[PDB]
Ligand binder design. Structure first.
Ligand SMILES: *Cc1c(COP(=O)(O)O)cnc(C)c1O
Ligand SMILES: *Cc1c(COP(=O)(O)O)cnc(C)c1O
Lengths: 382, 383
């Protein structure tokens, strides 16, 4: 039988560790889940179901229910696109668009672009971890409390908007080289902003944020380590790629993406490889020396991409090469993508040139809009 | 009986003038269109149906069909949000979102925000006129031809993107006061940009564009005069406000917005007042001396708002007041609207205070995202 999962989400408070993902993987591979005589007594299984996108759980003895029956494939979006609040629109105005590009790559590699700027608060992929993180402290941490993090531009904006929505205050710490929109827009949204001119990277701010947290008593949400980040992308970004590829008739042979926190691509890889382990994940490595906003090299410390059982391929991409792809996609599709989106397109283009990819449909996650990066666009047209 | 309108759309090539809108208004008012014996002999009636958003026409002798049967309400975004091309995404990734605000206005005036930054190319309301203009010359004008116009930032970006999707080249003329994204992003999109530092406004550039058009032989698409702008907003923005209000359970009592070309608010007013003449159109007048990007005062010259049978009220709004609404919406809703969106919100707030408006639901058209306007945001926070 079917019950609403909403009544069992306290298991998100109490399940720890990655062992529950064995259940997620097996439910996805088999396309079904076994009924729980006592759902309460199997919290890891309930969490597995939530993380893959189920809105319902199977209840009883001996029965089983399909992904479909569990609500994994339920249509979210009202046909008329009317929403009673911005949060409801974040939650139900999904999937984010998946749009076939007319970019021509060698070897039958067809490019689709997933447009994560379609998230309303930060115009970026970062809404999803912000919502998930804030919503799940929202029972134990007191309203009016300060939450904070080290961030590049997008999550600081996401965090500021979402914290306030849920009744919290936000503080955002950014390196000197962050874009001005990351420094300014959080203030518009009601947050405090701290820029460290000296910090050479976003993760270099983390020790200061942790020290300040101990002295000042604010909640350090730590997107780089907070599993709700990964889980948000499992139930959202990754579930969407899966459902979109199926209902859209793609022959999904891989995904391509970039890595900051590693949240969105680790989820994409893990989810899709659960259904079909041969699906490739092609991932961007900002070339040494270069800085591409929002993203980093794997060696500098990433949680999910390293700890989870996922196969991926790297590809080196310079800032110059990423911006060339931004120009190519703009001239080809009339779509203005961000530097990191361009990096992911280029990575896919390289692996396509090398003959490494089966012909078929490949989904590139585009983290944000290129409108935000006028100085990088200016340099790229020279 | 019904026939697909696709087989009758050469009327768009041949019909001229505004007389056809009489038919559009009556069909919307009665909520039904009557069958045509020979549709080919009634091209104005066919155009009327295309412009209000019908996908089918009524065919027969004596019969009639509702807006619903005609496909006017058949604008559903697909549940899976998968689009086999960018143009298909522009076409089918609609309606743009209509989101209830928590802004508190006096006298029972409830605010809904229509987010036109959800257009795919220029992230603005201007994609819609760009696509309709270019698609409808995409037959008669030879590929590789140059298309051009005088513009503020948004339509320059939209024109540039759309031109390339239909196999044209683009040139964009902007005044010196235009935003940097307007000067730069068309070049990313492959277009030529001409900036006139001295030009005090966008419409001041028009004589020079027209002169250059005569000399160099490019198509001046002229958004300020081209009826496909109005028509795009009739079948897009306006039809969406109508259909979204109905299906969404709103008690629609008015729309608020701003004027550049006057394309989108003239359409919203004309379409909705066709259905119900008591629906108000509250329009922004940028206070004398001030410049709100993308928008103008009625007196400086406008086509559809003056020629069409619509009612509206004007509210004066300073740049400062427009930006105060941007701050307020950001703090209330967590959404960042543009200066002209903020102005429309303020125009609605002002009218609401004056006791002028029926209590109920009001849709504010938000032309773009305020993410772009960082200097104006900076200045606004200093207060
Ligand atoms: C956060 C972000 C990324 C990387 O996303 P994660 O899910 O942190 O790995 C890439 N690009 C941009 C612009 C971002 O904001
Ligand atoms: C075009 C535009 C307007 C006005 O729209 P029209 O349909 O030209 O009257 C308002 N604001 C912005 C930002 C625009 O680009």
């Amino acid at each position: 039988a079917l019950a609403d999962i909403s009544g069992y989400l306290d298991v998100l408070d109490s399940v720890r560790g990655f062992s529950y993902l064995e259940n997620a993987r097996e439910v996805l591979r088999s396309g079904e889940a076994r009924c729980l005589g006592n759902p309460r007594s199997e919290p890891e299984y309930v969490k597995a179901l939530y993380v893959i996108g189920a809105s319902r759980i199977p209840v009883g003895d001996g029965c089983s229910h399909t992904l479909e029956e569990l609500g994994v494939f339920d249509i979210s979006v009202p046909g008329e696109m009317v929403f009673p609040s911005p949060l409801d629109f974040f939650e139900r105005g999904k999937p984010t668009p998946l749009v076939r590009s007319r970019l021509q790559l060698p070897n039958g590699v067809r490019v689709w672009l997933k447009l994560e700027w379609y998230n309303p608060f930060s115009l970026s992929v970062k809404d999803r971890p912000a919502v998930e993180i804030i919503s799940r402290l929202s029972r134990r941490v007191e309203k009016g409390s300060l939450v904070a993090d080290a961030t590049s531009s997008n999550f600081g904006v996401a965090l500021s908007a979402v914290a306030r929505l849920y009744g919290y205050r936000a503080r955002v710490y950014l390196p000197g080289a962050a874009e001005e929109f990351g420094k300014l827009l959080p203030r518009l949204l009601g947050a405090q902003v701290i820029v460290d001119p000296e910090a050479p990277s976003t993760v270099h701010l983390l020790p200061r944020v942790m020290k300040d947290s101990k002295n000042e008593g604010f909640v350090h949400v730590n997107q780089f380590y907070n599993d709700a980040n990964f889980e948000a992308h499992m139930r959202g970004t990754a579930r969407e790629i899966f459902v979109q590829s199926r209902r859209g008739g793609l022959a999904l042979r891989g995904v391509a993406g970039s890595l900051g926190t590693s949240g969105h691509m680790s989820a994409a890889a893990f989810y899709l490889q659960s259904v079909d382990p041969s699906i490739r994940a092609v991932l961007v490595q900002p070339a040494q020396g270069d800085s591409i906003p929002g993203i980093r090299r794997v060696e500098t410390g990433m949680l999910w991409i390293n700890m989870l059982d996922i196969s991926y391929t790297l590809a080196e991409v310079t800032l110059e090469e990423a911006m060339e792809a931004v120009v190519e996609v703009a001239r080809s599709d009339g779509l203005v993508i961000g530097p990191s989106g361009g990096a992911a397109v280029k990575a896919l283009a390289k692996k396509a040139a090398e003959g490494d990819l089966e012909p078929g449909d490949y989904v590139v996650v585009v983290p944000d809009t290129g409108f935000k990066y006028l100085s990088l666009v200016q340099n790229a047209l020279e």
